Ligand binder design. Structure first.
Ligand SMILES: [Mg+2]
Ligand SMILES: [Zn+2]
Ligand SMILES: [Zn+2]
Lengths: 72, 49, 97, 1285, 50
RNA sequence: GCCUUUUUAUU
DNA sequence: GTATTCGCCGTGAATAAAAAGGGTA
DNA sequence: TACGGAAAAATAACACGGCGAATAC
């Protein structure tokens, strides 16, 4: 998007933000994973950051979503 | 550099160590360069090539 | 000069220079430090392996971008294997663990 | 892989790499392009030249992978397998390695305890050694008939290999271990401590000494040295195999001794020319006079693999073109061309074509791109709608040289680089052609949007000021709006809001600058007041965000003024309203600059009428000075300083007369009296704003340019009398080029030095990564701003801005672990306290890095520094960035403050003066608030008019001294007696005056006798070349004089960072005690201090031309200089302390940084000296494992000390060594990082003989080996990698 | 500069242990004497060169 | 299909 | 044994274009 | 079809620190 200052206040560290957004982008590319955000015509780079703008995607709650996919 | 006798000097802090240096350069059109350089020990030394 | 894919050099597996040689842009040692200053670890690992070094990777990347998947795989850089044979051509032993 | 181990190549290890043996010197056949049998390019030895095709042409169709034929024996495989397989040669004679021979120190020379000169005489067959002693060829004929049956001698590397086979590793190390424990040597101990370090590292890496001498030599793969339709390496390989084949031809026919010693020498020189060039008897040259590239020439230097092919790898999906302005696009956007981005995103087009189903293949998708139809561009704008694209300048001497953008498709093959980041690139639009790059994968695209985007790159990493500064045009459009004019259109009218001023100006009935009253709504909640605001400043209120105040807008808004306007928006409003605000500044500052019409012309500025009278007065003033020199009133040196005095005063008189003709010149009748207001000249609008012209640049423009410098450094006597408006003269323009072409030759040559300084600064600081959140150490340095100048330039507001304190200072005022924010730093400013103990970089004790809280703030983000950021690379890039910006008496206390003297044992005088007795005195101008602003280091012998502890008024002389003569001051009063002071032998008198003779030119009758002066208790001694005006029998006071003793920028950054000794080093005192005179008949004065509790037999070495600062009658102290001049960086660490050297290097680098005007924070230099203090010399072994004389890293002795503190044995202390940016980058761990810097022929030999298996730590290593960087999000990958291991 | 005084036929020209000015250069030119008295220690510091 | 020197030119 | 000078050796920015030359009879 | 390397070249000859080696005292 325009700026990333709203997504960095939810996680803190900037390099932890790239790790959680890359794993969110891998699920949106190969294994489906339709996002909870309203889908627009932008690419998956902005969708990986728009989910952290309100705080529905974090580095702690993405690992429990990977284990939820492994149980199914 | 023109062929002939060239009197050079490097004052200040370039190879001085607290003393002035005077090197005389005789350079030909072709051949071997002939140099007469000083030292901080105050002894004229000749340098060829 | 713009180059996506083209002919590579024969000494090391790297792109070429000049518009007549399809225009592979040289990064340089000064721009590696400006890339690692921000902390772009995934970008600097791409900039010198997937672009030039990973011969087994840049063909797997070229089959991945045309598939629609932007996934980078870790590989052994052949540009360091160029450097590995240069030290091994001397009387100096060097190996990987 | 996790580690790389380097050792010596075994004869079995070389044959293990090679799959075949080469016997032919010719590379390929001359008739056809097919290799012969056992050749350098043969398919049986290395592999086939075609993909799955044999050399004969029988095995094809890819139906086999590991078949071996029987006709030609060619193992058919892939083409890339030929790049890995190597070959070897079996030499008839052993060959010594040239890298281990010509290195400093020699690896072969230290094993055979011989120097470089005799170890090469036996190798090139001029001498013989036994299997030790060195005997020549004429001593070999007598040795066979006298001691021929007892000992046998050989020559060449065969005798070297037989001697290394004879000696043992454990037997030679035991003889050297007992020699170091009992020796009274210093220089001889240095030669022995590097030899036992060579022996102790062989048994740890299990490397035999005979493996250094090469019996078998390996060759490169043929794809590593490929033939082309003749190379610079394969012709050099023909020099070696021709010598290898001729030695095999000499053994079978029983060649004599004369011809085999000459053939083995040329065989040894062929390997010496193959593995290296430039370190031999003569470097081999090619047929076209160029030096031939060896295996070392293609591994070191700029043309090596480490710089051209491992750090300078060329990049696909990446283009290069010139840059443009592009004002219509946003800050996160730029402009990519249509046919250029189509060629950069060529697989990205193929991915979207197969996704939708237009072309579900790779062959017809190439036809759709090359046809350039209408459906290709609609696919293209979906890919480049939000794709980050790295814009990259080809010189990046700064961090901001690589910024990401979200481009749009435009016409024209040039990139539209944003003007707000144009000052961040430090590169104007002067036709510069620069690169561009894209990230392919999604984990690399998020690195560009979260870290490399231009939106979150507002603040510079160097200083707290933002790097997004409006430079020329947008600030000019802002400056024409924010102005006040009388008698304007629509003067004195009301406005409903700030948005109505856009209606007021676009209709054209009112001017852009008119004194009106607009209603504004200010936030932090909304307040409203009717203040005096012009029409142009009311346009700004719709541009600024809500929470931005008005008090930063009400000024003239120059470039120096709006640098804080962009900084205050980042501070209290946040980054999310900063991008819209900065874009709307660029939208308003560009569109209103078109409506401004600010231009340059001959009618804009005007030559003042006072200029023609000043030049006529200055030309009349030099007429009487020249006539005084003809009569003989002044000398040559006094006249030369007087002409520059009366011209620079005339240059300052014409500077103010030209300034008032641009400030208050043009007036307009405002329906009444003619009032004095600010002139609306466009030259002054570009001068007061500080946009592109300074106060001195317009001085050179409208007025005379002043004094110009000579090429050697002196000043022209007669400067330029005219100016550029009416034109210069021929000689006036010629002496103008004496500083302009000199400054441009300064610019074009210091970029080769600052570019080398950029490589020297990063390569030593690339290992330093932040790794911990909190450690728990309270150690740190004391912070003090610049006080030695007259006016304070950099106060404590910008010094400790964003640095976590170590110890809590007092007025409990501040906590320890709390980071100093912008509010906490202002709380320290209002208290006006100094000596703040902060956490420094050199005070942190962690492994391969420092802590996050021990560093401070990043100054590029609003929060604290993130864990896992390259903390030594962001600072070293902001050190070379001002490298191309800078070039390559009595006291008078002007301000008001109370004086204060520290460590001064002041006594009473005869007149009541505050007389000093110590050498190192520092004045403290303590104010009434509690801080200081002025400081002066007066010499020893300055008479102070007032004592210490009272207030000194401003403009009053407090002290006075003589710099040419150094006096001596006693402590107490009493009678004086000339003890051991006789005349005729060592004292002569010249006429009424006494003088002591110098120690060099004196006779041999008074060399032993030294003068003295005791009180009648303290004894005072005087040195030579002194004048004693005092006679015997006169009562003197304490402060009376007894002996009169008469007498660029970028190199300063280069000499201090390398930790070198200057031409005039300052000697320091080791132990505080009594210093004597010295010893004569030596040629150089020696210093010795024998205190009660000090070290007796310590001696120094001082040259005769240097002088002694401290006297031999007074007590010396640890930290007092002995020689006047610049302090050496090596002696301030070993003697004054560890926290003292990190204050000296920072404050002297920042001293020459203020001369250019750049603002670099002090912590950025502090991370470099931490990489200069990471090498230490341990003073005692004790319970440790390594030797005392060995020099290892500080990170190795710190983890080993914490292991001892948990155990019962005590830890061994260490002494740090200040290895510079060249020294510490080589003699360190991570040999991959050290081989890329320099000395690849040396530091690879230092790592092969010592093991040095690096643990994949460092940034230069991970770049060369090509994996994830441990200073980004790969630090989290490295954090999980330590959890896996 | 010498520590001894140079005399010539009972006339003192150079003072012992004092740097002379440029007045003694022009004064000595009118009364050139080709023989003076010199101590034995001044010549020992020189070289013989023959 | 290249590589290395040299020259010009750019920042 | 202790310096001391010096021979040789590390380094001398970055990036685009053209030219010959790629062993000698 | 052979040797690739030597002595002459009627060679090209820089500057600012640095490390180890061969002397004076
Ligand atoms: Mg430019
Ligand atoms: Zn075959
Ligand atoms: Zn710490």
């Amino acid at each position: 998007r325009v700026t990333v200052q709203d997504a960095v206040e939810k996680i803190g560290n900037r390099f932890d933000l790239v790790l959680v957004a890359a794993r969110r982008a891998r699920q949106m590319q190969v294994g489906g994973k339709d996002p909870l955000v309203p889908e627009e015509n932008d690419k998956t780079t902005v969708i990986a950051l728009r989910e952290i703008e309100e705080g529905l995607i974090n580095n702690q709650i993405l690992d429990v979503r990977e284990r939820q996919e492994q149980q199914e | 550099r023109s062929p002939g006798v060239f009197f050079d000097s490097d004052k200040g802090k370039t190879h001085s160590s607290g003393k002035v240096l005077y090197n005389a350069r005789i350079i030909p059109y072709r051949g071997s360069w002939l140099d007469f350089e000083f030292d901080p020990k105050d002894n004229l030394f000749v340098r060829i090539d | 000069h713009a180059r996506s894919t083209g002919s590579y050099s024969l000494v090391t597996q790297q792109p070429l220079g000049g518009k007549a040689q399809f225009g592979g842009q040289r990064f340089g040692e000064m721009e590696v430090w400006a890339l690692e200053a921000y902390g772009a670890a995934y970008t600097l690992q791409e900039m010198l392996t997937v672009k030039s070094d990973d011969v087994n990777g840049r063909t797997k990347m070229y089959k991945n971008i045309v598939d629609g998947n932007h996934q980078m795989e870790p590989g052994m850089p052949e540009s360091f294997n160029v450097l590995l044979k240069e030290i091994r051509s001397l009387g100096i032993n060097i190996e990987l663990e | 892989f996790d580690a790389i181990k380097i050792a010596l190549a075994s004869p079995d290890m070389i044959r293990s790499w090679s799959f075949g043996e080469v016997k032919k010197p010719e590379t390929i056949n001359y008739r056809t392009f097919k290799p012969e049998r056992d050749g350098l390019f043969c398919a049986r030895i290395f592999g086939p030249v075609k993909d799955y095709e044999c050399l004969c042409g029988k095995y094809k169709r890819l139906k086999h992978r590991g078949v071996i034929c029987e006709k030609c024996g060619v193992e058919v495989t892939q083409t890339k397998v030929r790049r890995e397989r190597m070959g070897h040669i079996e030499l008839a004679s052993p060959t010594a390695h040239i890298w281990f021979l010509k290195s400093l120190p020699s690896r072969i020379g230290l094993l055979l305890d011989m120097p470089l000169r005799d170890i090469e005489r036996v190798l090139y067959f001029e001498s013989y050694v036994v299997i030790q002693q060195i005997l020549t060829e004429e001593q070999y004929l007598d040795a066979l008939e006298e001691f021929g049956d007892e000992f046998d001698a050989k020559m060449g590397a065969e005798a070297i290999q037989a001697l290394l086979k004879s000696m043992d590793l454990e037997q030679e190390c035991e003889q050297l271990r007992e020699e170091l424990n009992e020796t009274n040597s210093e220089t001889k101990r240095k030669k022995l401590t590097k030899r036992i370090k060579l022996l102790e590292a062989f048994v740890q890496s299990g490397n035999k000494p005979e493996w250094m001498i090469l019996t078998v030599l390996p060759v490169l793969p043929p794809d590593l040295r490929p033939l082309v339709p003749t190379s610079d390496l394969n012709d050099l390989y023909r020099r070696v195999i021709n010598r290898n084949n001729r030695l095999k031809r000499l053994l079978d026919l029983a060649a004599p001794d004369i011809i085999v010693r000459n053939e083995k020498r040329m065989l040894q020189e062929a390997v010496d020319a193959l593995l290296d060039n430039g370190r031999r008897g003569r470097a081999i040259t090619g047929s076209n006079k160029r030096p031939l590239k060896s295996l070392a020439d293609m591994i070191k230097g700029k043309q090596g693999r480490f710089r051209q092919n491992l750090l300078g790898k060329r990049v696909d999906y990446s283009g290069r073109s010139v840059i443009t302005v592009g004002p219509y696009l946003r800050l996160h956007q730029c402009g990519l061309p249509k046919k250029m981005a189509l060629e950069l995103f060529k697989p990205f087009i193929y991915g979207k074509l197969e996704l939708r189903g237009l072309a579900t293949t790779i062959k017809a998708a190439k036809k759709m791109v090359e046809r350039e139809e209408a459906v290709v561009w609609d696919i293209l704008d979906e890919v480049i709608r939000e794709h980050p694209v790295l814009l990259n300048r080809a010189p990046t001497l700064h961090r901001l040289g690589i910024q990401a953008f979200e481009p749009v498709l435009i016409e024209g093959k040039a990139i539209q680089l944003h003007p707000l980041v144009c000052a961040a690139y430090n590169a104007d639009f002067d036709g510069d052609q620069m690169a561009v790059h894209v990230p392919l994968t999604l984990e690399a695209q998020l690195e560009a949007r979260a870290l490399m985007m231009s939106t979150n790159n507002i603040l510079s990493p160097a200083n707290g000021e933002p790097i997004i500064v409006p430079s020329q045009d947008v600030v000019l459009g802002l400056y024409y709006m924010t102005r006040d004019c009388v008698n304007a259109k629509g003067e004195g009218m009301v406005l409903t809001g700030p948005k109505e001023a856009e209606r007021l100006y676009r209709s054209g009935l009112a001017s852009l600058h008119a004194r009106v009253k607009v209603r504004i709504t200010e936030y932090e909640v909304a307040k409203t007041s009717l203040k005096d605001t012009t029409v142009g400043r009311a346009i700004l209120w719709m541009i600024v965000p809500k929470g931005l105040p008005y008090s930063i807008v009400n000024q003239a808004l120059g470039k120096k003024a709006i640098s804080k306007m962009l900084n205050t928006c980042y501070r209290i409003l946040g980054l999310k309203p900063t991008v819209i605000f900065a874009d709307q500044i660029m939208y308003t500052g560009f569109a209103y600059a078109a409506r401004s019409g600010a231009s340059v012309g001959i009618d804009d500025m005007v030559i003042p009428e006072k200029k023609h009278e000043i030049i006529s007065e200055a030309e009349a003033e030099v007429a009487e000075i020249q006539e005084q020199f003809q009569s003989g009133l002044v000398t040559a040196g006094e006249r030369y300083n007087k002409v520059i005095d009366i011209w620079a005063a005339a240059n300052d008189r014409v500077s103010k007369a030209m300034m008032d003709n641009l400030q208050t010149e043009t007036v307009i009748n405002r329906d009444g009296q003619e009032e004095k207001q600010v002139s609306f000249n466009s030259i002054y609008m570009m001068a007061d704003s500080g946009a592109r012209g300074s106060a001195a640049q317009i001085r050179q423009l409208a007025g005379m340019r002043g004094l110009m410098a000579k090429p050697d450094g002196s000043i022209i006597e007669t400067p330029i009398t005219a100016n550029f408006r009416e034109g210069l003269n021929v000689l006036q323009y010629f002496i103008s080029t004496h500083g302009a072409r000199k400054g441009l030759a300064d610019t074009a040559l210091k970029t080769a030095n600052s570019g080398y300084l950029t490589r020297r600064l990063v390569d030593v600081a690339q290992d330093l990564v932040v790794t911990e959140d909190d450690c728990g150490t309270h150690e740190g340095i004391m912070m003090t701003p610049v006080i030695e100048g007259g006016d304070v330039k950099e106060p404590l507001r910008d010094r400790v801005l964003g640095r976590v304190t170590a110890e809590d200072v007092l007025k409990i005022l501040v906590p320890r672990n709390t980071l100093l924010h912008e509010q906490w730093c202002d709380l320290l400013e209002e208290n006006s306290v100094d000596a703040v103990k902060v956490r420094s970089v050199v005070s942190c004790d962690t492994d391969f890095g420092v802590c996050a809280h021990c560093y401070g703030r990043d100054l590029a983000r609003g929060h604290i520094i993130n864990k896992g950021e390259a903390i030594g690379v962001i600072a070293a890039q902001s050190i070379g960035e001002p490298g191309t910006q800078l070039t390559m008496s009595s006291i008078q206390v002007k301000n008001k403050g109370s004086i204060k003297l520290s460590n001064v044992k002041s006594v009473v005088n005869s007149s009541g003066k505050l007389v000093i007795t110590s050498r190192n005195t520092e004045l403290k101008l303590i104010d009434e608030f509690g801080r200081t602003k002025e400081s002066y280091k007066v010499p020893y012998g300055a008479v102070l008019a007032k004592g210490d502890g009272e207030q000194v008024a401003g403009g009053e002389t407090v002290a006075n001294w003589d710099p040419h003569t150094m006096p001596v001051i006693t402590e107490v009063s009493g009678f004086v007696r000339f003890t051991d002071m006789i005349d005729g032998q060592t004292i002569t008198r010249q006429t009424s005056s006494l003088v002591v003779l110098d120690s060099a030119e004196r006779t041999a009758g008074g060399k032993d006798l030294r003068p003295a002066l005791k009180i009648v208790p303290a004894q005072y001694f005087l040195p030579g070349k002194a004048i004693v005006q005092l006679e015997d029998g006169v009562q003197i006071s304490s402060g009376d004089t007894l002996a009169r003793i008469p007498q660029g920028g970028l190199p300063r950054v280069a000499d201090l960072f390398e930790a070198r000794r200057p031409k005039e080093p300052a000697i320091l005192a080791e132990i505080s005690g009594i210093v004597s005179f010295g010893k004569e008949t030596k040629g150089k004065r020696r210093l010795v201090i024998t205190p009660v509790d000090g070290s007796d037999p310590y001696e120094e070495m001082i040259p005769k031309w240097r002088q002694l600062n401290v006297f031999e009658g007074e007590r010396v102290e640890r930290g007092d200089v002995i020689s006047d001049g610049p302090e050496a960086p090596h002696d301030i660490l070993r003697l004054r302390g560890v926290h003292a050297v990190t204050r000296y290097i920072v404050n002297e680098v920042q001293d020459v940084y203020r001369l250019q005007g750049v603002k670099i924070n002090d912590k950025h230099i502090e991370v470099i000296v931490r990489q200069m203090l990471r090498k230490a010399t341990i003073v005692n072994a004790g319970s440790s494992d390594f030797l005392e004389g060995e020099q290892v890293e500080y990170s190795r002795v710190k983890i080993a000390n914490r292991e001892l503190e948990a155990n019962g044995k005590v830890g061994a202390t260490y002494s740090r060594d200040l290895l510079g940016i060249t020294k510490a980058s080589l003699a360190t761990e991570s040999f991959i990082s050290a081989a890329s810097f320099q000395e690849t022929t040396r530091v690879l030999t230092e790592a092969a003989v010592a093991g040095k298996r690096d643990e994949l730590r460092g940034l230069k290593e991970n770049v060369i080996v090509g994996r994830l960087i441990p200073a980004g999000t790969g630090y989290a990958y490295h954090q999980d990698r330590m959890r896996r291991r | 500069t010498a520590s001894f005084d140079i005399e010539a036929n009972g006339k003192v020209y150079v003072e012992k242990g004092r740097r002379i000015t440029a007045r003694h250069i022009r004064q000595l030119e009118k009364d050139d004497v080709k023989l003076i008295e010199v101590p034995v220690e001044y010549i020992a510091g020189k070289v013989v060169a023959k």
